[PDB]
């Protein structure tokens, strides 16, 4: 069956592939909301409404209906029963028909496995409640008006037609015709919440027959909305017969994107469970899939992952594994290793395109430019090829930052020069911070913040960092008046409410997805992995210190250079941190010990001398001389 | 400045009980993150933004060549621009709008106060960008919604909802709601924005600021509220800043309509033209209520500390570094049990609590319920090793840590009498290798646990044990786990994102148990690993590092968290102990160099080294 689903994926229509792509993207982003109809509940053998209509017809008319119930009859017959026999008989029949316990069908679990932001259901049963409780998913269940204000969570299970949690009374649910007539008057808050959720999320309709009253009401409401001011909801159709082309065209022009289960797979006309499971699995199994078949798709996907990083001058290689969601290990020497890429290998394909010009030539012009940009990015970031194809690799490092080289004359010359763009303003603010003029540095960073999303977040972090260093310098001096007390008061007023921990959370989710690797700059977690690394090889080297037996020192040096290049070329004030300086000092001490061992059986370079002169104290140099 | 603070405290002490309750509810909603500010035009006028009556005057002058003799009525404010839009061209209307509104104005301190109140969303009828500028400066990013299309593609979860539009697209009358026509067809032209505003109002606590009681938007919202079911909504708060005190009849009439009114003129005395004074008075009252500057008596610090601590009663042990997050960095909790005032600007409630603890006579003055709450707080603080302030031995109570395997088996065999007993049983089974039984027990607890902190911890531990089972299966390839069990756990754990586990909890839990969020993180010991660098300095650090290690171990074992068995924690323990011993050896060598004739390890250090160090690591320790 799974390979049958894979075959269906192979024969999937292009539009269905796109619809599954958007559904999976919304599920990943947490903006997916599932609109569950009555078919899903029926799959669990829940008492259908027509049985209740039959019971009311027998109770009042005395005989079952000879023919078939029309759409209005389903609401009129219960209304007639309510009017004539009264409320008590209606509630009694509702109780004796609905107080049954039914197992949750696998469709409920498949819906929950998609991680929906909300579940809007017209069902009055607790089947979705039971499924959520079993799976351990917490949903604030809203079935009355007072439940909207008393919601206990930000994720809602919205029963727009109510349920029987309060009791098995007809007042708690929307069943008869009068309930549907006064629904807007009786349920203003619930209807408003449903409309808001539909507007602000991606809606997938499952369990509806494309002719249900609720579906047409939502379509009518959507009709009033401004053109192209909303996202078209998805409708999963599970009817046995394939949908007609004319009906599909009519409903798609009305604001629906229809995925027909009968079109994807062939099944018996009574096998509704198969029809539901086909689409649910095809949605679930596409979560891991990246829909990558051809080379241009590889280029487009890698460009989508990498292009936000084009704002940054340099990117740590170890951070790249976070960019690709741990699909590949990006080692510090420029080699890539398959780590968790279960699907088609897009990095292998990218390297194959890079090495041979023939496959690079057979690309679209847009894709050709994207591949050229990716090639420049990877060459400038030191990524060479995969581990198997990698040959001799040299440890060549360069840092293109005036602050690192201490070009203080050029530093001030560029400082005095008028800035051209916001990137020049960012570099000038970093230069001001490096030049000891933290006052003008803070002012320029605030100006960049105001004039501004990578630069905005980076400037916010840098402004907080210089505020912290200003506070530390003032405390040290008073524990000389470099800063006026007015400036201290203003910066304290501006910065005391600001919290650096939740700055990343207070960012657009597009930024939080594209620039995840930047979050580490908020705290010292940025230096975590390397630090841990810096420890273990140390011990390992110390072992190789005594027993006398790529090189560990090479990995340590490459991680050191990657950190330095990322922190300096990106103009981040974290270069002034005590923890960063301690990390550099420890790395250099370990490297020098390894050099001392290797000499009696590598050499000091310019960048090494700069690092030692900047990050070492006199006592550490004395210890290095002694050892 | 200080006189203003004293006056504010005096006003709060003489505040009416109804206003006090309103302030308490507003502060509680702000703490819970359910607060939303409905910003009126008064806040914009506080920044000298061009008022609408000036635009009406300009339109009247262009229409008739002379300003109107007298005063416009309420209908004229919307009619005269409509008459100009009709009889004159739309281009002239847009040009006048551009000439009057394309100005740069600073953000008044009221914007800063509103943002410092931490609102979930900000709904505004203003078409200016002053609130946008304030949010941009303060670092809190808001999804600015000012058109129909902005609702669909909302970047963040918090909205700067301009229900009347703005001039971001351009200084065009079509992008804003100014004319009478725009108000008439507002529902037809702004369905999504109106629905979003109504949903936010229903689902949040709304505080109205910058509005008059007779404002058009206020009355329209009250009319919509009238349609709602009785007691099905929270009554919005209304900050009234008019120079004259509100009449009692108007007050009761509007309170019956659903508005809880805090009247600025009734609180403080101010000049007729000093609107900013009244706005600042109300906003600062709210803020210093949030900042605990108005806590002036005992049995009230007890209530605050109890509200902060009582959710932690479920947890067995709390890290000292966690108490910093519990009180929002108000106090530094040193590992040696000493407390230091760090960032709180209000009353020193911790100092008062310790003074109550020291002297029994002051403790006796508390109320009976407050006395019992203080007793519980004292038991909690002495159990967690918090003694007193700065100016005034490790012990881990866990059978798993000491390796009392027989006792763990005996405890497993007995019948559990509570959910916490089931949690301890599951952790003991995990430590004993019975990982399938541990997973089943954690699943059962998750089923039967819906405070809900045990539920969250059981979810965390179940994910951790599932990861442990997966890694054991990968490394083994014996069949310790049946393939049916592996398939079942894979089907249960597929698309299970632990990163969203904390966010899926109730927001009351997310506020009470912030300190547990780090348990859902992939890495949670990066801070301590980073501060381990102080032991490598060659120029107390060792004792604080050791005490923090002990704190982490006690928290992870007493609270029965499976993350103690992972490679990251073992690595942290190994690094910390190795660095401590190496630093002690370096100190001994330096002393013998400078003097010519260090680390004292105990039972817990021996257990840590035995459990977490490999043979190679101990060999390296001996060699170095």
Numbering used by the authors:
A (entry chain A): 11 to 462, 468 to 494, 504 to 573, 578 to 629, 645 to 670
B (entry chain B): 8 to 399, 406 to 463, 467 to 493, 504 to 565, 579 to 636, 644 to 670
Tell me, in the authors' exact words, what the paper reports.
The recently identified bacterial Sir2 domain-containing protein, defense-associated sirtuin 2 (DSR2), recognizes the phage tail tube and depletes NAD+ to abort phage propagation, which is counteracted by the phage-encoded DSR anti-defense 1 (DSAD1), but their molecular mechanisms remain unclear. DSR2 forms a tetramer with its C-terminal sensor domains (CTDs) in two distinct conformations: CTDclosed or CTDopen. Monomeric, rather than oligomeric, tail tube proteins preferentially bind to CTDclosed and activate Sir2 for NAD+ hydrolysis.
Subsequent 3D classification allowed us to obtain a 3.1-Å cryo-EM structure of the apo form of DSR2 containing all parts of DSR2 density. Protomers 1 and 2, as well as protomers 3 and 4, form a basic X-shaped dimer through interactions mediated by MID-to-MID swapping and Sir2-to-Sir2 interactions, resulting in a total buried interface of ~4200 Å2. A structural comparison among the four protomers revealed that protomers 1 and 3, as well as protomers 2 and 4, share similar conformations, while protomers 1 and 2, as well as protomers 3 and 4, exhibit distinct conformations. When superimposing protomer 1 onto protomer 2, we observed similar conformations for Sir2 and MID with a respective root mean square deviations (RMSD) of 0.205 Å and 0.373 Å, but substantially conformational differences for the CTD with an RMSD of 3.763 Å. Specifically, the CTD in protomers 1 and 3 adopts a closed conformation (CTDclosed), while that of protomers 2 and 4 takes on an open conformation (CTDopen). These conformational differences contribute to the recognition of invading phages (see below).
